[PDB]
Design an enzyme around this catalytic site. Structure first.
Site, PDB file in Angstrom:
ATOM      1  N   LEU A  22       0.822  -1.213   0.000  1.00  9.69           N
ATOM      2  CA  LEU A  22       0.000   0.000   0.000  1.00  9.69           C
ATOM      3  C   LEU A  22       0.842   1.241   0.000  1.00  9.69           C
ATOM      4  O   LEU A  22       2.019   1.245   0.444  1.00  9.69           O
ATOM      5  CB  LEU A  22      -1.005  -0.046   1.135  1.00  9.69           C
ATOM      6  CG  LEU A  22      -2.009  -1.262   1.219  1.00  9.69           C
ATOM      7  CD1 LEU A  22      -3.109  -0.931   2.049  1.00  9.69           C
ATOM      8  CD2 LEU A  22      -2.577  -1.676  -0.198  1.00  9.69           C
ATOM      9  N   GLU A  30      -8.264   0.763   9.666  1.00 11.00           N
ATOM     10  CA  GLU A  30      -8.717   0.701   8.257  1.00 11.00           C
ATOM     11  C   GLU A  30      -8.714  -0.788   7.801  1.00 11.00           C
ATOM     12  O   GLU A  30      -9.654  -1.313   7.175  1.00 11.00           O
ATOM     13  CB  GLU A  30      -7.924   1.630   7.384  1.00 11.00           C
ATOM     14  CG  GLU A  30      -8.710   2.120   6.157  1.00 11.00           C
ATOM     15  CD  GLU A  30      -9.028   1.056   5.128  1.00 11.00           C
ATOM     16  OE1 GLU A  30     -10.208   1.006   4.656  1.00 11.00           O
ATOM     17  OE2 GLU A  30      -8.126   0.243   4.783  1.00 11.00           O
TER      18      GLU A  30
HETATM   19  N1  LIG Z   1      -7.412  -1.256  -1.558  1.00 11.68           N
HETATM   20  C1  LIG Z   1      -6.209  -1.258  -1.887  1.00 11.68           C
HETATM   21  O1  LIG Z   1      -5.512  -0.077  -1.645  1.00 11.68           O
HETATM   22  C2  LIG Z   1      -5.690  -2.303  -2.765  1.00 11.68           C
HETATM   23  C3  LIG Z   1      -4.353  -2.292  -3.149  1.00 11.68           C
HETATM   24  N2  LIG Z   1      -3.884  -3.284  -4.025  1.00 11.68           N
HETATM   25  C4  LIG Z   1      -2.478  -3.124  -4.499  1.00 11.68           C
HETATM   26  O2  LIG Z   1      -2.552  -3.112  -5.894  1.00 11.68           O
HETATM   27  C5  LIG Z   1      -1.376  -3.823  -6.454  1.00 11.68           C
HETATM   28  C6  LIG Z   1      -1.849  -5.165  -7.184  1.00 11.68           C
HETATM   29  O3  LIG Z   1      -2.736  -4.786  -8.166  1.00 11.68           O
HETATM   30  P1  LIG Z   1      -2.498  -4.836  -9.678  1.00 11.68           P
HETATM   31  O4  LIG Z   1      -1.011  -4.557  -9.932  1.00 11.68           O
HETATM   32  O5  LIG Z   1      -3.566  -4.045 -10.281  1.00 11.68           O
HETATM   33  O6  LIG Z   1      -2.735  -6.403  -9.999  1.00 11.68           O
HETATM   34  P2  LIG Z   1      -3.870  -7.591  -9.927  1.00 11.68           P
HETATM   35  O7  LIG Z   1      -4.014  -7.974  -8.565  1.00 11.68           O
HETATM   36  O8  LIG Z   1      -5.043  -7.168 -10.676  1.00 11.68           O
HETATM   37  O9  LIG Z   1      -3.089  -8.757 -10.665  1.00 11.68           O
HETATM   38  C7  LIG Z   1      -2.973  -8.746 -12.111  1.00 11.68           C
HETATM   39  C8  LIG Z   1      -2.682 -10.160 -12.520  1.00 11.68           C
HETATM   40  O10 LIG Z   1      -3.963 -10.887 -12.219  1.00 11.68           O
HETATM   41  C9  LIG Z   1      -4.431 -11.631 -13.270  1.00 11.68           C
HETATM   42  N3  LIG Z   1      -5.662 -10.971 -13.735  1.00 11.68           N
HETATM   43  C10 LIG Z   1      -6.136  -9.735 -13.405  1.00 11.68           C
HETATM   44  N4  LIG Z   1      -7.398  -9.678 -13.920  1.00 11.68           N
HETATM   45  C11 LIG Z   1      -7.721 -10.842 -14.500  1.00 11.68           C
HETATM   46  C12 LIG Z   1      -8.847 -11.300 -15.193  1.00 11.68           C
HETATM   47  N5  LIG Z   1     -10.002 -10.579 -15.396  1.00 11.68           N
HETATM   48  N6  LIG Z   1      -8.838 -12.583 -15.628  1.00 11.68           N
HETATM   49  C13 LIG Z   1      -7.785 -13.385 -15.441  1.00 11.68           C
HETATM   50  N7  LIG Z   1      -6.677 -12.972 -14.871  1.00 11.68           N
HETATM   51  C14 LIG Z   1      -6.634 -11.682 -14.393  1.00 11.68           C
HETATM   52  C15 LIG Z   1      -3.330 -11.544 -14.337  1.00 11.68           C
HETATM   53  O11 LIG Z   1      -2.529 -12.647 -14.136  1.00 11.68           O
HETATM   54  P3  LIG Z   1      -1.888 -13.512 -15.216  1.00 11.68           P
HETATM   55  O12 LIG Z   1      -0.822 -12.683 -15.881  1.00 11.68           O
HETATM   56  O13 LIG Z   1      -1.304 -14.634 -14.463  1.00 11.68           O
HETATM   57  O14 LIG Z   1      -2.946 -13.923 -16.178  1.00 11.68           O
HETATM   58  C16 LIG Z   1      -2.644 -10.192 -14.030  1.00 11.68           C
HETATM   59  O15 LIG Z   1      -1.307 -10.052 -14.629  1.00 11.68           O
HETATM   60  C17 LIG Z   1      -0.469  -4.109  -5.290  1.00 11.68           C
HETATM   61  O16 LIG Z   1       0.307  -2.892  -5.009  1.00 11.68           O
HETATM   62  C18 LIG Z   1      -1.455  -4.225  -4.113  1.00 11.68           C
HETATM   63  O17 LIG Z   1      -0.856  -3.853  -2.854  1.00 11.68           O
HETATM   64  C19 LIG Z   1      -4.614  -4.395  -4.408  1.00 11.68           C
HETATM   65  C20 LIG Z   1      -5.912  -4.414  -3.956  1.00 11.68           C
HETATM   66  C21 LIG Z   1      -6.519  -3.362  -3.155  1.00 11.68           C
HETATM   67  C1  LIG Z   2      -3.677  -3.735   4.416  1.00  7.99           C
HETATM   68  O1  LIG Z   2      -4.059  -4.401   3.173  1.00  7.99           O
HETATM   69  C2  LIG Z   2      -3.130  -4.754   2.156  1.00  7.99           C
HETATM   70  C3  LIG Z   2      -1.763  -4.598   2.404  1.00  7.99           C
HETATM   71  C4  LIG Z   2      -0.898  -4.917   1.368  1.00  7.99           C
HETATM   72  C5  LIG Z   2      -1.296  -5.396   0.143  1.00  7.99           C
HETATM   73  C6  LIG Z   2      -2.661  -5.561  -0.109  1.00  7.99           C
HETATM   74  C7  LIG Z   2      -3.586  -5.236   0.914  1.00  7.99           C
HETATM   75  C8  LIG Z   2      -5.004  -5.369   0.728  1.00  7.99           C
HETATM   76  C9  LIG Z   2      -5.715  -4.234   0.412  1.00  7.99           C
HETATM   77  C10 LIG Z   2      -7.115  -3.935   0.258  1.00  7.99           C
HETATM   78  C11 LIG Z   2      -7.974  -4.407  -0.697  1.00  7.99           C
HETATM   79  O2  LIG Z   2      -9.233  -3.819  -0.507  1.00  7.99           O
HETATM   80  C12 LIG Z   2      -9.053  -2.974   0.524  1.00  7.99           C
HETATM   81  N1  LIG Z   2     -10.038  -2.191   0.948  1.00  7.99           N
HETATM   82  C13 LIG Z   2      -9.826  -1.420   1.998  1.00  7.99           C
HETATM   83  N2  LIG Z   2     -10.832  -0.651   2.416  1.00  7.99           N
HETATM   84  N3  LIG Z   2      -8.603  -1.391   2.620  1.00  7.99           N
HETATM   85  C14 LIG Z   2      -7.582  -2.173   2.175  1.00  7.99           C
HETATM   86  N4  LIG Z   2      -6.387  -2.092   2.804  1.00  7.99           N
HETATM   87  C15 LIG Z   2      -7.808  -3.012   1.079  1.00  7.99           C
HETATM   88  C16 LIG Z   2      -5.855  -6.572   0.966  1.00  7.99           C
HETATM   89  C17 LIG Z   2      -5.564  -7.248   2.305  1.00  7.99           C
HETATM   90  C18 LIG Z   2      -4.139  -7.009   2.804  1.00  7.99           C
HETATM   91  C19 LIG Z   2      -5.823  -8.709   2.068  1.00  7.99           C
END
Ligand SMILES: NC(=O)C1=CN([C@@H]2O[C@H](COP(=O)(O)OP(=O)(O)OC[C@H]3O[C@@H](n4cnc5c(N)ncnc54)[C@H](OP(=O)(O)O)[C@@H]3O)[C@@H](O)[C@H]2O)C=CC1
Ligand SMILES: COc1ccccc1/C(=C/c1coc2nc(N)nc(N)c12)CC(C)C
EC number: 1.5.1.3
Length: 186
Positions: A22, A30
């Site tokens: 993050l 959070e």
């Molecule tokens: N709330 C928050 O602030 C959140 C933060 N994050 C952060 O975001 C980042 C990760 O996200 P991001 O980089 O967008 O990557 P994703 O988690 O979306 O991963 C992408 C990989 O997932 C597979 N993929 C994604 N969509 C599909 C689909 N529709 N069908 C099949 N395969 C799919 C692919 O794998 P393949 O190449 O193997 O096919 C792709 O290369 C990290 O920094 C994480 O910490 C993540 C979630 C929430």
């Molecule tokens: C602390 O959380 C993280 C730390 C490092 C990498 C990924 C995350 C995650 C992020 C969030 C996805 O939707 C989310 N929605 C909210 N409201 N908060 C979040 N934090 C996530 C998922 C959980 C760890 C599993």
């Protein structure tokens, strides 16, 4: 199967991740909100399902992996089987949602929560039908290398409150943030 939802925390510059973590330091309450909202199911004998991309899965430290008390589904076209600790693997978002209707899951899954990353959020958000977004607005800019897709407010209505979601400003580690819920039905 019950409702379809996305949940995210996002900075003011729309960041959601940097370098597989993050953009901000850990916000313990959070994170507790994320665990509560995704785990709590009102339907007896069911659990919620979390759907995530492959890089989001591997962003969860092994300690919190699988997300406990939820069924964990990973999206990937490269993987041949679910990762260690995960429960399911699908090759598309539509496939994962179709799977919830199969006999293996049809009576086990309550809510479906898309937990990221940016491409999965985008596709979920642009897919016709009833969808809610649970968005935590982290009210500062933070250097990011991911980003949340645009929320089209012509279709996503910001709800004026929602049970179980605090409406006022929160603050941890000197970082103010607030919880929002949006709903579309198209
Ligand atoms: N709330 C928050 O602030 C959140 C933060 N994050 C952060 O975001 C980042 C990760 O996200 P991001 O980089 O967008 O990557 P994703 O988690 O979306 O991963 C992408 C990989 O997932 C597979 N993929 C994604 N969509 C599909 C689909 N529709 N069908 C099949 N395969 C799919 C692919 O794998 P393949 O190449 O193997 O096919 C792709 O290369 C990290 O920094 C994480 O910490 C993540 C979630 C929430
Ligand atoms: C602390 O959380 C993280 C730390 C490092 C990498 C990924 C995350 C995650 C992020 C969030 C996805 O939707 C989310 N929605 C909210 N409201 N908060 C979040 N934090 C996530 C998922 C959980 C760890 C599993």
């Amino acid at each position: 199967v019950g409702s379809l939802n996305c949940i995210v925390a996002v900075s003011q510059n729309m960041g959601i991740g940097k370098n597989g973590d993050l953009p901000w330091p850990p916000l313990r309450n959070e994170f507790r909100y994320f665990q509560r909202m995704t785990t709590t199911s009102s339907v007896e004998g069911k659990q919620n399902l979390v759907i995530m991309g492959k890089k989001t899965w591997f962003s969860i430290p092994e300690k919190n992996r699988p997300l406990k008390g939820r069924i964990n589904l990973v999206l990937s076209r490269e993987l041949k089987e679910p990762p260690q600790g995960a429960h399911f693997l699908s090759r598309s978002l539509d496939d994962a949602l179709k799977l919830t209707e199969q006999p293996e899951l049809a009576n086990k899954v309550d809510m479906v929560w898309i937990v990221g990353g940016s491409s999965v959020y985008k596709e979920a958000m642009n897919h016709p039908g009833h969808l809610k977004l649970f968005v935590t607005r982290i009210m500062q800019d933070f250097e990011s290398d991911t980003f949340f897709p645009e929320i089209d407010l012509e279709k996503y209505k910001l709800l004026p409150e929602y049970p179980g979601v605090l409406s006022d400003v929160q603050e941890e580690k000197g970082i103010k943030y607030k919880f929002e819920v949006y709903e579309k039905n198209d």
